[PDB]
């Protein structure tokens, strides 16, 4: 076993309860599957192994996996019908992360989403499916990544505004589609679409929510998100549900679309309970994050949990003028080991955990999390917007480290990915360009 691997990543935890339950059975199995991969001794693993004992990111294998993922699927994949916009997004995001120019997909993106847009506003899973905020989010982010005036022009902005206005609920949150569920993912996806398209802040004059005293898309929204915090400190999908990393990301990112992190986050969330719960998402020896208490690590939380960290850290540090920092309050080393040692599939693609087949969702979010650990992401007093703070995020590289330490970069520079915006989950330039283009278009009559 490679000398660059600390004991922390090569042994189960010291404390072990005598009582066996299903939870500990699954936890034990997961640890046992991860250990040979963490140690770099599994026959499935490809090198080179770096000085920390970690295999290279297999860039060519993942590129080919992601390009393949954008082509045709057989009949058996029918359950993905409503997720087709996500499939486009997850692939383009992973390709961007890996350093590809995705401009050549502009026309194919336009062709895909044109049929999925409804005349009454918004984008759904495809022709004849009702508009849904997650499809719309995936489509908008895909359009941002490919760029170009022709893709930007595809969206009917006025109809999108009218439709989104129908989803605004009396309690301040959003349903995901008309007649659909209300949860924090709905609020986050709606507000990202609203921000990137520079939609008017006011609700449409005839929005039903106006009958409940609400006037704008953000009226009652941070209060709603506050009501989704739980006694554990984390944030649930809807009030009273269980704290979960995916919803913590949605709520914190949504709050950061409303003002500066150091203003909004402490105002609406109890950071005293949020911080330790977020910290407790990470396990050893696996190194990765679980989504909720007493469940298992999963590489997709490299994004959902991982990208809560720059948001929370900005809430603590405050806006940086163009200065000391709390730094990283989780283990970048552990997360990197989990992703590179445990989540890479030998044939390409990344996975939830050992024993799982890869998929493009897990590939996108494991890579997104790997990128997070490679950058300082922080907010500034300099915005591209004429949501000001949300367009003020900037980045500096956090370079690959040498030696031992509590906050180190154990990826190689050969593993470096493109930085992603921690709120918009696309490259900063892509988010900037779309927002600025729309700011400069008059709202349609």
């Amino acid at each position: 076993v490679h000398p660059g691997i600390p004991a922390l990543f090569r042994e189960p935890p010291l404390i072990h309860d005598l009582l066996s339950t299903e939870t500990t059975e699954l936890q034990s199995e997961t640890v046992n599957k991860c250990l040979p991969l963490l140690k770099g001794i599994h026959n499935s693993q490809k090198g080179p192994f770096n000085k920390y004992g970690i295999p290279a990111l297999q860039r060519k294998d993942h590129l080919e996996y992601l390009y393949d993922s954008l082509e045709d699927y057989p009949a058996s994949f029918v359950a993905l019908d409503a997720s087709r916009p996500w499939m486009v997004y997850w692939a383009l995001a992973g390709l961007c992360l890996l350093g590809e120019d995705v401009t050549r997909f502009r026309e194919r993106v336009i062709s895909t989403f044109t049929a999925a847009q409804n005349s009454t506003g918004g984008i759904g899973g495809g022709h004849g499916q009702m508009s849904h905020v997650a499809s719309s989010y995936a489509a908008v982010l895909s359009i941002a990544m490919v760029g170009g005036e022709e893709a930007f022009k595809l969206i009917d902005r006025k109809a999108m505004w009218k439709w989104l206005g129908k989803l605004k609920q009396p309690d301040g949150g959003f349903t995901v589609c008309e007649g659909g569920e209300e949860d924090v993912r709905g609020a986050y996806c709606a507000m990202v679409v609203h921000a990137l398209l520079d939609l008017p802040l006011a609700l449409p004059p005839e929005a039903e929510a106006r009958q409940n005293g609400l006037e704008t898309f953000t009226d009652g929204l941070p209060e709603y998100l506050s009501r989704c915090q739980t006694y554990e400190g984390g944030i649930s999908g809807s009030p009273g549900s269980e704290a979960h990393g995916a919803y913590a990301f949605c709520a914190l990112a949504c709050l950061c679309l409303l003002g500066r992190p150091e203003v909004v986050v402490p105002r609406y969330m109890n950071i005293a309970t949020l911080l330790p719960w977020l910290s407790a998402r990470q396990y050893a020896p696996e190194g990765g994050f679980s989504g909720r208490t007493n469940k298992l690590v999963d590489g997709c939380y490299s994004h959902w949990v991982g990208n809560c960290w720059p948001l929370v850290q900005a809430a603590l540090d405050g806006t940086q003028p163009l200065r000391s920092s709390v730094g990283n309050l989780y283990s970048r080393e552990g997360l990197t080991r989990y992703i590179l040692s445990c989540c890479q599939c030998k044939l390409g693609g990344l996975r939830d955990k050992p024993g799982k087949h890869p998929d493009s969702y897990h590939t996108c979010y494991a890579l997104t999390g790997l990128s997070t650990v490679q950058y300082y992401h922080y907010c500034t007093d300099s915005s591209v917007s004429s949501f000001s703070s949300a367009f003020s995020w900037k980045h500096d590289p956090n370079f690959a480290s040498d030696g031992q330490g509590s906050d180190i970069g154990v990826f190689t520079e050969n593993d470096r990915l493109v930085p992603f915006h921690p709120i918009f989950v696309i490259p900063h330039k892509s988010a900037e360009d779309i927002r600025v283009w729309f700011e400069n278009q008059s709202f349609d009559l």
Partner: protein, 335 residues
Amino acid sequence: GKYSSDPEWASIKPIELNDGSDFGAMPLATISYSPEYLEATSYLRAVMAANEMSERALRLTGDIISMNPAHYTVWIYRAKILFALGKDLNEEIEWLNKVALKHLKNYQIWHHRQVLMSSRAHFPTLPPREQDFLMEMFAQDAKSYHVWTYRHWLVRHFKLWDHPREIQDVEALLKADVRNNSAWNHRYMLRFGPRDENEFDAGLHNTTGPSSEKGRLPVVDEDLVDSELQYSQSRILEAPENRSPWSYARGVLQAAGRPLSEWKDFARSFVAVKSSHAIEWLADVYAEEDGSEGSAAEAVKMLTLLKEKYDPIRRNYWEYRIRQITASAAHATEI
């Protein structure tokens, strides 16, 4: 084709799929749908465009769901039809149970259930075998997020916070697996969740107050608090490294406006360490509620045990706590 040959369907023309593959550039991530799914969905487009509320449309939604229960549009349209036609929703629930049992991980089914069950005209009171059905689901996956979310909704809707099956079912699940955090979270809702029907739902009391006071009860039942803390200690002793009951107890103390030091001796009994949670508990007691000389150093000692031995992956968080405590002590020393 089944639909195209059925006289039942003759009166309506299907709308064929336009996927973008014919007009311009080739679309992305396409699926080569079966002919049966293409045909059924072409008829669905046609009936939805016509806003058709009919028995044939209802059957069509059932057929599409049998092929793809992850089609969110068809579920929403199905609910519209059920209400428009005044269908028997008891029978719809019995059918939905079968779909739920076949597709454990499907959440669309559970939103549909909430939509139906919310109709007080059809379900004025808790149906007599509804809780048993939820338990049939939890017997197969005890942490199912969508089923727990539905059960939270059900408790608020039918006002079941003090209903003995809610607490009994939580307790049966915690007997089976004391580490089931979903059951602990539901227990908190039952015992300490806000109930005021004139307020928007919230996971915690006092969300109109300062965030540091989130969770504080306006009125505390002290005997209930004692009972819940005793329960938590009893479960902890069965498996002291189980985070769930420790987090629950912190929630209880916060709701009650009681200090963590109420459990100082209990936490000390696990210190030779049987629980990392006990160590963190002591760190907070010494740092935040003990104002005596030497308490800050002891908190730092506890956090050092965590960073070096008992939860080292969280070292940067423990070090942040050490920095906070050290700064606070230095401020205290200078005033």
